[PDB]
A paper describes a structure:
The adhesin FimH at the fimbrial tip specifically binds in a catch-bond mode to terminal α-D-linked mannoses of N-linked glycans of the receptor uroplakin 1a on urinary epithelial cells. FimH is a two-domain protein, composed of an N-terminal, mannoside-binding lectin domain (FimHL) and a C-terminal pilin domain (FimHP). FimHP possesses an incomplete immunoglobulin-like fold that is completed by insertion of an N-terminal donor strand of FimG, the subsequent subunit in pilus assembly. The two-domain architecture of FimH is a prerequisite for catch-bond formation because the interactions between FimHL and FimHP determine the conformational state and ligand-binding properties of FimHL.
To test whether ligand-binding causes domain separation in FimH, we determined the co-crystal structure of the ternary complex of FimHF18·DsG with n-heptyl α-D-mannoside (HM), an established model ligand of FimH20, as well as crystal structures of the isolated FimHLF18 and FimHLK12 lectin domains in complex with HM. The isolated lectin domains (residues 1–159) of both FimH variants (FimHLK12 and FimHLF18) were produced by direct expression in the E. coli periplasm and were purified as described. Displacement of GN-FP-4 from FimHL by increasing HM concentrations under equilibrium conditions showed that both FimHLK12 and FimHLF18 bind HM with 3,300-fold higher affinity compared with the respective FimH·DsG complexes (Kd values 1.1 and 3.0 nM, respectively). In an inverse competition experiment, in which HM in preformed FimHL·HM complexes was displaced by GN-FP-4, off-rates of 2.0 × 10−4 and 3.5 × 10−4 s−1 were determined for FimHLK12 and FimHLF18, respectively, corresponding to dissociation half-lives of 58 and 33 min. On the basis of these measured off-rates and equilibrium dissociation constants, kon rates of 1.8 × 105 and 1.2 × 105 M−1 s−1 were calculated for FimHLK12 and FimHLF18, respectively. The on-rates for the isolated FimHL domains are thus 30-fold lower than those of the corresponding full-length FimH·DsG complexes. Previous ligand-binding studies on the isolated FimHL domain mimic the domain-separated Sbound state of FimH. This state is characterized by extremely low off-rates and is promoted in vivo only after ligand-binding and the onset of flow conditions.
Numbering used by the authors: 1 to 158
C-alpha cells in the first residue's frame, strides 16, 4: 500500500509524510462554505490486492493558522460528515486494487461570525490529515501524514 499527491509526491510502503499545495477559492462570506476536496489531491493503491485487503481511515484531522482561528469546519470522509478538527477516527474505506483511487476526504469550512480581511494567508499550513492504513493480513498499522498548504490568500468580506 502506497500513496501519492496529484503532483506525483509519493509516500511509500510503511508510511511517512508529504506536503499538499492547493489553490483555495479566494473569497468566502459568513454563511457560505469554503470547500477543499482533497480526493483530487491524494491517491492510494493496494500493492497485492489478490492476497491482502487494505483498510484506510482518516485517523485525525487538525486545523492550523487561519482555518483554526477563523473557520468552523466539518470533514466528509467517504461521503459522511464529521467534526473538523476531528474528535474521533473515521470508519474505514477498502483499497482492493493496484489502480490508484482517491482518498475520499473533503473539508467544509465556514467563517466564524467575527472573521474578516485576509483569513487564510498564502503559503500557510491549513491542516494536517493523518491517513491510517491497516490490512486483513498482519499487524501493519501505518501513518501517511498529509500537510495541507494554501497556495493563495482567502478573504472573508464583512
Ligand atoms: C504472501 C505474503 C505477501 C506479502 C506482501 C506484503 C506487502 O505489504 C505491503 O502491501 C500490502 C498490500 O497493499 C499492505 O497491506 C502492507 O501494509 C504493505 O504496504
Amino acid at each position: 500500500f502506497a500513496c501519492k499527491t496529484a503532483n506525483g509526491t509519493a509516500i511509500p510502503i510503511g508510511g511517512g509524510s508529504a506536503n499538499v499545495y492547493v489553490n483555495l477559492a479566494p473569497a468566502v462570506n459568513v454563511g457560505q462554505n469554503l470547500v477543499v476536496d482533497l480526493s483530487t489531491q491524494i491517491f492510494c493503491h493496494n500493492d497485492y490486492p489478490e492476497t491482502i485487503t487494505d483498510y484506510v481511515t482518516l485517523q485525525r484531522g487538525s486545523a492550523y493558522g487561519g482555518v483554526l482561528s477563523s473557520f468552523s469546519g466539518t470533514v466528509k470522509y467517504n461521503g459522511s460528515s464529521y467534526p473538523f478538527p476531528t474528535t474521533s477516527e473515521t470508519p474505514r474505506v477498502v483499497y482492493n486494487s493496484r489502480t490508484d483511487k482517491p482518498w475520499p476526504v473533503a473539508l467544509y469550512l465556514t467563517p466564524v461570525s467575527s472573521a474578516g480581511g485576509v483569513a487564510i494567508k498564502a503559503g500557510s499550513l491549513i491542516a494536517v490529515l493523518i491517513l491510517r492504513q491497516t490490512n486483513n493480513y498482519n499487524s501493519d498499522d501505518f501513518q501517511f501524514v498529509w500537510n495541507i498548504y494554501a497556495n493563495n490568500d482567502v478573504v472573508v468580506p464583512t
